[PDB]
Design a protein around this ligand. Structure first.
Ligand SMILES: C=CS(=O)(=O)N1CCCN(c2cc(NCCC(=O)O)nc(-c3ccccn3)n2)CC1
Ligand SMILES: [Mn+2]
Length: 298
């Protein structure tokens, strides 16, 4: 029953346009800020190596009940063992190999399960893993890991999320932030929110199955917030934004029915997603994947 929102802009910059990220994002701004989110595909030869300490990478993911709002209010893993769990869950759920499940089917099933009161689906998300714990997905000239000569251009690239500017201009900065990692599985999700201080954010999918995004342009931010408070459970209606944002899951078609412009995209491995200032966004993972994200300043 789910109607996919229209696709957000996708940019395939040339090698010349790929020289500086902030310069490129500034040039695409007239279009991309009207959609809230956009996708950027690097040149096909731009392939950074995965530089996390895989042997020691261990985490305890958080548990997500898809229908918790409809129902209630209304293990330690390695990267390998989490991937085995994630692939087994998806192949068992859809009764087919994980790479044969259409992205439109996972999308339709996700939003059906969020509002379903008869079926309780529970997944796990390896979220808010600091790049300091096991290293960034990008190579970094930190001295803690070896960098091959062919990898040094990626350690120095402006599209390396560790090299994005993160310092905001202020007077307090004169009288006086690292990327985070996300290990996803099928149906693991993030609800509608904006970044702190209305900041930009950039997201890179290092590997795995796609991450599905939904975005709302900043000019409709107040409209989305009014629809939320109208339709979010009245028990949470008076909560501050910073807390309400923890339980603001909502079908994009419901927002679209109330006149809120929503755009979608499937972020595939090796592709960037940029969220613009005060652009509400949400999404879910199609399967086992690994993403890295950071807020940056212009
Ligand atoms: C509001 C998010 S959440 O309540 O749904 N939640 C679960 C999902 C994982 N994680 C996230 C994920 C996320 N973006 C998607 C990145 C990706 O998955 O690749 N942004 C934030 C966030 C929180 C406060 C201020 C700014 N950002 N937290 C923890 C919290
Ligand atoms: Mn966020």
């Amino acid at each position: 029953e789910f109607v996919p929102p229209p696709e957000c802009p996708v940019f395939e910059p040339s090698w010349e346009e790929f020289t500086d990220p902030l310069s490129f994002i500034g040039r695409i701004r007239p279009l991309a800020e009207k959609t809230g989110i956009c996708k950027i595909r690097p040149p096909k030869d731009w392939q950074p190596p995965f530089a996390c300490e895989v042997k020691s990478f261990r985490f305890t993911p958080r548990v997500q009940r898809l229908n918790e709002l409809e129902a209630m209010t209304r293990r330690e893993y390695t990267l390998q063992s989490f991937g085995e769990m994630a692939d087994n869950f998806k192949s068992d759920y859809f009764n087919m190999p994980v790479h044969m499940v259409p992205t439109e089917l996972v999308e339709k099933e996700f939003w059906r399960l969020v509002s379903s009161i008869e079926e309780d689906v529970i997944v796990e998300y390896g979220a808010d893993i600091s790049s300091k714990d096991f290293g960034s997905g990008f190579p970094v000239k930190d001295g803690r890991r070896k960098i091959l000569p062919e990898e040094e251009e990626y350690a120095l690239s402006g599209w390396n999320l560790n090299n994005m500017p993160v310092l905001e201009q202020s007077v307090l900065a004169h009288i006086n932030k690292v990327p985070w990692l996300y290990v996803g599985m099928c149906f693991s999700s993030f609800c509608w929110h904006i970044e702190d201080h209305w900041s930009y954010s950039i997201n890179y999918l290092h590997w795995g199955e796609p991450k599905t995004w939904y975005g709302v342009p900043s000019h409709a931010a107040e409209q989305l917030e009014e629809v939320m408070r109208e339709l979010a459970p009245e028990l949470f209606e008076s909560q501050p934004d910073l807390l309400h944002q923890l339980v603001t899951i909502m079908n994009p078609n419901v927002l679209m029915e109330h006149g809120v412009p929503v755009y979608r995209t499937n972020q595939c491995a090796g592709e960037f997603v940029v969220t613009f200032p005060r652009a509400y966004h949400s999404g879910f993972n199609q399967g086992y994947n690994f993403a890295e994200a950071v807020n940056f300043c212009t």
